[PDB]
Design a protein around this ligand. Structure first.
Ligand SMILES: Nc1ncnc2c1ncn2[C@@H]1O[C@H](COP(=O)(O)OP(=O)(O)NP(=O)(O)O)[C@@H](O)[C@H]1O
Ligand SMILES: [Mg+2]
Lengths: 492, 266, 488, 124, 133
């Protein structure tokens, strides 16, 4: 039985392809035999050798069958068995074991471990196996993409030409997109189209993604991004039947694609869930777009969006960014087309709040280009009035986060100077902005040592407390938070 | 055994039928429905708890036939009313009617849905967690995704306007994320989607599953390995026997009992 | 800090007593045992020093009387329960030293008579704090079982069972002739560290926490703590004599007794001889801990989850213990849960780098021996462990001011005896001005929470690398006390 | 408000003309938020990623200098093939080319070793 | 080297790629591989640079037999750089750092007797300074 089963597994790995069902049946046989106690009691490690098997080949076959945890366990068992066999023979690091496995079996342990860990999707485990071929450009590019180092990824993608062309342009487009760089991406796509008429489907999908994200409505097995572009175009053209049909088709395709695969890891579900959330949000906003638009409906929609964003607090940035981008596109479309009765002021306020939230979220994940783009979009629709707003403070925070302290300090000082004369304890929101700006300026000046403590107390830290307290804008929840923060800063 | 065999034979006869119906086909269908109604009435009258294991499949088979023809709609409607409305007072059938999928939103099902909602909310209004638990408990019965088509819709309506309780559910499930209810619901929905592939009306089921999964975004579930639901009674019965041969006998007999209700005669 | 000297309208003691009385009024279940511990500081002699102690005792008595003015039943019931605990702890329990199956509690013990205590919650439970004054629907003690087990040790602590109002049993460990206040203080530190770790997204995503248990000191000499059910010491699992993992999996290697004998006989030798003997012992003694998760979780998914949880627990415990200078981390002071595969640290008497003052000083920041690394998988300390350590150290560095504040509050506690003394040093290692010290400990802690190691500023990754390379260094491991069991 | 000339802008222009680097940090009190001043500061400190992002973001800047700065930033970051494809796309989207763009095109052609392109400028 | 001096990290990578286009890694290592390791170190990617330098040292341990003076200078410089990097990153205990890298570089520079040169004196000075530090 041992020789015949080993022959079956090495024939599976020979490739002489075999059906997946036979491989799964033999894997089930091995898994069942793993859990049975042998007549000679021994230990649990002894129970894994009812047959004289080579567990590296079994692990490779299981990985081919998308049994990632089983493949990992079998690789561990094979490594342990090899170590004990060597210890018997004499009477080693991962690299030596990998070389021995490659020169006897043809499979290197390090590459199999890396593939299994990539399939599982646990981030930290990707750092455990890097002994061999870590200099290879594709591994370096994957590492750069994992850590969201888009500049290095772009440089390496452009430098290396031995990489296949399709994935090269895919990575270049992804890196350009993740750095902002929308107009550069559009011109690059136009040049790529000029230099080659033939286009692979992934490039077409990326082209549609860029088209719908950049708001260029002239482009006319449908992919997800093509469906999104068609739905947005139909929404602009007020053709609701095609809009709903496209959304339904995209939803069905996403669900079918997810359900075809064999699922073992939760990390394989997140992109599909994000896409389905985006589709659902677009469909929900469709009905609001169709009929008359009122302030209450927009406020309710924004409230539900904020609630679900709060629900998505611990999610990764790669799963939260597309939803925010679709929300921004939806708000811009609703502003530019449907509004003709001066109701666009409320939509402008909602869009400004959404962009401020997007800037905050992007700063939380150490991203400095998306906040700048959001601030530019805010400045496009909003003009600096006599009184300052929250988005100017957000811009100052963004500049501080970009390690440009002098410019942020200048912005905040100008804002405080304007507020000193503009406000007369009239607007509670303006008062909260004023006290928050005073506190932030005091903290920044204390951190940078650009002012002596006396001026810091007299002008900023005590002034914020005085403004928060004496103005008597009581009976609120935001005021209590601002007062707490000012008190804590002064106490510190 | 005889009751189960007769019920499943009639269910298999009904479930397969030509799209074009002649006089003889209509007569055969009417005869099958009359036999099923008579068997159900006799079983429920002679024994109260006889149909608690076959009620869900019978109802799921009878529901699609309501809006396919007018002549036979009367008979299936009367059978459904007798099964649900007439026997609402029976205590043995009360619990199994509690675990039934909601009827489709149509005028013909007005009284049936009124009675079903009255039975379901006897204790009181449900919270989001209770609704999800009810959906999961119902899901263990049938293997046809089509019967779930209405229920999924209701689930969506609960997920859209109860996110405040969803936050509390996520907060409560933080101690042991492995047994979290949201990841369990997502896995159940994915399995139901898998079972609907290559079946009649799969597109509507996929669309409903997609809407339900869109109501719950990429929430961090604090888990990595997906664990599939298992039968606790099966595990206890396995642990009853200590001999290997006895365990093998139990497994084989369970498989044979399960396959006794297949369509093929061989 | 309670006393009776600075009394008056604006006296410190008056305000402190008023605040303590108010806190006791609002939350009796969180403060009454603490007050009674000071009130009953010397009840062991009654049932069977300086002016500050007398003042504290009298103030505690005043607070107890004030509490009793509103809740007489609760006060009397808790006092009776504490007396029963102390009497049970003071029992000799020397004739049943060999017996392990279980010993019936003598009928004369009052603990066998206490039943249906509706006003007393189980002392060893973690009672959640509610902002409403009313405390309702809480599990309360209603019975005690008639038999008690014995925990292996020199002083023979007693393992008893308490059955509450919900009908489920809880195991408690009654200890006598030891100081349990230090353990409670360190548990408070661990709770504060857990709260700090919970509010960072990076460590909340990875579920990095410190396992904790409840300790209740009853007097200056006895106490009762929560027994961790479903846990086993790593030493008992690894180097047990008839069913240790090393014996079962590697019968041809050196036995644990042989390694211990070899290492004990080389103590009064040179460092090269110690090093060579240690290397020879390590050559014929290979780690077998990786099988712990292999024989308990046959499902690969559950096995992977448990291994990941074990690695994360090890990383978090190592970082937190290094920050607090925890010492005396031998195989019998660390437990592993048989269900979650997570580590629990007990016997936290030695902390704040007081283990380096011992005659055989401890030269490692934490325990990272070969078994601990082998339990992590083929990768070792290169994957999840290093990243989790870096995340925990970033969390500690980002909240340094709060940590200094907490440690400053603790180190000046008059009743916290954390400094090393010759008697404790002699007891710890047996083979078969305060202000300057506190200031120096605070200075060392402040240096630790920054990158200042050996006078140079280090990043989080560099500091983690230095700690890891110090923990696994064979020359460091060969120089420690044989009771620490470096080869294990 | 009396003469029509602001002292800060004149000082900044004089210091830019002189060319001393450190003196460029002394006068930044006013209009330092303006995109062109920020871009000049980024180019002075050789922060090419920030310069590229700001050049792409701001559209109110005149087109010729916008593409000139974009090409310079792409060149200084390496990015030769990306620069070539960007130039080809720019040529596709607009046939009319200003002389500075032609000179940059010749510079990229001779630096990238593409010998098919056939008041002559220095790079030409 | 010039691009690294001015805190530029893309031009050195492009230059290393151009070098690799015309040069293939032979049995013995060269100066450009050490330059690539230095570039990777300058890009704050310490693990990859350390792996490159360790592989290079492993190859040189068997490849060279005190034949080429330039190869000897490369070997001793690589040993010194690896020792300094390991000391900086605290990835090794001092005993191994002395025994394997810092003293080995001095031994290779001195005992091999490739004297009567100017580059050798510079390499010996650098190795002596590293060991003394
Ligand atoms: N909280 C606990 N939960 C479970 N087991 C415990 C707990 N505390 C102690 N033990 C076990 O009881 C054993 C006895 O330890 P202990 O009561 O501390 O006496 P000891 O070994 O002499 N230490 P010490 O009392 O300080 O001299 C330990 O080795 C553990 O196995
Ligand atoms: Mg102990």
């Amino acid at each position: 039985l041992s020789t015949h089963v080993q022959g079956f597994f090495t024939s599976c790995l020979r490739h002489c392809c075999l059906d997946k069902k036979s491989q799964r049946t033999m894997l089930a046989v091995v898994d069942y035999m793993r859990r049975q106690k042998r007549p000679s009691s021994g230990t649990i490690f002894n129970d894994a050798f009812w047959l004289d098997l080579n567990y590296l080949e079994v692990a490779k076959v299981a990985q081919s069958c998308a049994a990632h945890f089983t493949a990992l366990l079998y690789a561990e068992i094979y490594a342990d068995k090899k170590s004990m066999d060597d210890q018997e023979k004499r009477s080693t690091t991962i690299s030596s074991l990998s070389e021995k496995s490659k020169e006897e079996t043809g499979i290197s342990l390090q590459d199999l471990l890396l593939e299994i860990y990539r399939s599982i999707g646990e981030p930290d485990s990707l750092y455990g196996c890097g002994g061999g071929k870590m200099l290879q450009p594709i591994t370096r590019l994957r590492t750069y993409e994992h850590e969201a180092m888009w500049g290095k990824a772009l440089v390496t993608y452009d430098l290396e030409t031995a990489i296949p062309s399709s994935t090269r342009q895919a990575g270049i487009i992804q890196a350009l997109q993740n750095l902002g760089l929308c107009h550069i991406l559009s011109v690059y796509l136009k040049g790529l189209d000029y230099e080659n008429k033939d286009w692979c489907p992934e490039l077409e999908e990326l082209h549609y993604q860029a088209a719908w994200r950049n708001m260029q409505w002239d482009h006319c097995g449908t992919s997800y991004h093509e469906s999104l572009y068609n739905a947005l175009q139909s929404l602009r053209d007020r053709e609701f039947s095609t809009f709903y049909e496209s959304l339904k088709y995209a939803r069905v395709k996403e669900v079918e694609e997810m359900c075809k695969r064999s699922l073992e890891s939760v990390y394989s579900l997140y992109p599909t869930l994000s896409r389905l959330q985006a589709i659902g949000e677009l469909e929900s906003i469709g009905e609001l777009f169709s009929r008359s638009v009122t302030h209450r409906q927009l406020s309710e929609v924004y409230i539900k969006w904020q609630k679900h964003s709060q629900l998505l607090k611990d999610s990764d940035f790669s799963f939260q960014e597309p939803i925010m981008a679709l929300r921004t596109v939806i708000l811009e479309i609703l502003m530019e087309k449907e509004m003709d009765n001066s109701q666009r002021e409320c939509i402008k306020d909602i869009l400004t709040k959404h962009l401020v939230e997007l800037s905050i979220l992007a700063r939380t994940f150490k991203n400095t280009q998306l906040p700048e783009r959001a601030i530019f979009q805010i400045k496009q629709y909003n003009s600096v009035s006599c009184g300052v707003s929250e988005w100017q403070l957000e811009e100052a925070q963004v500049f501080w986060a970009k390690k440009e302290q002098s410019l942020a300090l200048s912005i905040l000082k100008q804002m405080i100077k304007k507020l000193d004369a503009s406000c007369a304890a009239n607007n509670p929101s303006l008062k909260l902005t004023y006290t928050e700006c005073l506190r932030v300026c005091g903290n920044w000046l204390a951190e940078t040592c650009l002012e002596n403590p006396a001026v810091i107390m007299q002008t900023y830290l005590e002034k914020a407390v005085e403004v928060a307290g004496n103005y008597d804008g009581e009976s609120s929840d935001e005021l209590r938070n601002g007062k707490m923060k000012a008190f804590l800063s002064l106490a510190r | 055994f005889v009751l189960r065999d007769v019920i499943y034979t009639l269910i298999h006869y009904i479930n397969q039928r030509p799209s074009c119906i002649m006089d003889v086909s209509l007569r055969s269908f009417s005869l099958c429905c009359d036999l099923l109604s008579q068997v159900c009435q006799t079983a429920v009258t002679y024994c109260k708890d006889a149909l608690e294991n076959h009620l869900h499949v019978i109802v799921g088979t009878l529901i699609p036939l309501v809006y396919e023809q007018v002549e036979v709609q009367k008979q299936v409607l009367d059978l459904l009313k007798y099964l649900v409305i007439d026997n609402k007072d029976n205590e043995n059938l009360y619990i199994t009617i509690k675990l039934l999928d909601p009827f489709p939103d149509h005028v013909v099902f007005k009284d049936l849905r009124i009675t079903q909602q009255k039975i379901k909310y006897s204790r009181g209004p449900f919270s989001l967690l209770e609704e999800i638990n009810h959906f999961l408990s119902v899901s263990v019965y049938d293997a046809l995704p089509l019967t779930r088509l209405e229920g999924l819709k209701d689930l969506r309506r609960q997920l859209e306007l109860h996110k405040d309780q969803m936050v509390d559910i996520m907060r409560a499930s933080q101690d042991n994320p492995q047994d979290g209810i949201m990841v369990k619901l997502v896995v159940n929905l994915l399995q139901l989607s898998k079972m609907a592939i290559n079946h009649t009306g799969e597109k509507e089921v996929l669309e409903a599953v997609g809407s339900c999964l869109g109501e719950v975004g990429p929430i961090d579930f604090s888990t990595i390995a997906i664990q599939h639901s298992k039968d606790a009674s099966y595990t206890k019965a396995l642990k009853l026997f200590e001999d290997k041969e006895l365990q093998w006998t139990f497994i084989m007999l369970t498989y044979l009992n399960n396959t006794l209700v297949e369509d093929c005669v061989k | 800090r309670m006393g009776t000297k600075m009394m008056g309208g604006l006296g410190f003691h008056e305000v402190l007593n008023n605040l303590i009385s108010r806190i006791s009024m609002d939350h009796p279940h969180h403060t009454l045992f603490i007050i009674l511990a000071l009130a009953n500081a010397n009840r062991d002699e009654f049932l069977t020093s300086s002016q500050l102690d007398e003042d504290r005792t009298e103030a505690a008595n005043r607070i107890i009387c004030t509490i009793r003015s509103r809740r007489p039943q609760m006060v009397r019931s808790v006092e009776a329960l504490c007396d029963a605990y102390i009497i049970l702890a003071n029992l000799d329990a020397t004739q049943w030293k060999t017996q392990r199956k279980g010993i019936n509690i003598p009928a004369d013990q009052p603990i066998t008579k206490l039943k249906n205590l509706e006003d007393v919650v189980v002392p060893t439970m973690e009672i959640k704090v509610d902002h409403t004054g009313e405390y309702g629907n809480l599990v309360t003690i209603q019975s005690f079982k008639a038999e008690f087990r014995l925990a292996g040790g020199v002083n023979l602590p007693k393992i008893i069972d308490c059955v509450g109002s919900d009908g489920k049993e809880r195991r408690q460990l009654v200890k006598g002739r030891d100081d349990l206040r230090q353990d409670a203080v360190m548990q408070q530190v661990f709770q504060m560290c857990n709260t700090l770790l919970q509010r960072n997204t990076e460590t909340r995503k990875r579920k990095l926490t410190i396992c904790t248990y409840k300790v209740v000191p009853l007097s200056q000499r006895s106490g009762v703590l929560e027994w961790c059910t479903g846990t086993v010491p790593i030493g008992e699992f690894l180097v047990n004599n008839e069913d240790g993992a090393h014996k079962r999996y590697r019968p041809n290697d050196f036995s644990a007794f042989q390694c211990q004998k070899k290492m004990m006989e080389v103590q009064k030798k040179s460092f090269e001889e110690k090093y060579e003997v240690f290397m020879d012992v390590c050559q014929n003694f290979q780690p077998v801990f990786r099988y712990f998760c292999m024989e308990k979780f046959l499902d690969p998914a559950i096995w992977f989850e448990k291994r990941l949880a074990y690695t994360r627990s090890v990383a978090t415990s190592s970082i937190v213990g290094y920050i607090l200078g925890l010492g005396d981390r031998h195989v019998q002071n660390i437990l592993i849960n048989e269900q979650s595969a997570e580590l629990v640290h007990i016997d936290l008497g030695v902390a704040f780098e007081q283990g380096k003052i011992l005659p055989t000083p401890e030269t490692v920041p934490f325990r990272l021996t070969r078994d601990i690394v082998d339990g992590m998988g083929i990768t070792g300390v290169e994957g999840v462990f290093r990243r989790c350590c870096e995340k925990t150290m970033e969390v500690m560095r980002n909240s340094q001011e709060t940590l200094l504040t907490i440690v400053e509050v603790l180190l000046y506690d008059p009743l916290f005896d954390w400094t090393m003394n010759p008697l404790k040093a002699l007891y710890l290692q047996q083979r078969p001005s305060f202000n300057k010290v506190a200031e120096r400990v605070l200075m060392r802690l402040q240096e630790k929470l920054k990158g200042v190691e050996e006078g140079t500023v280090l990043s989080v990754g560099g500091q983690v690398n230095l700690l890891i390379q110090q923990a696994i260094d064979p020359k460091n491991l060969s120089r420690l006390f044989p009771g620490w069991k470096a080869w294990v």
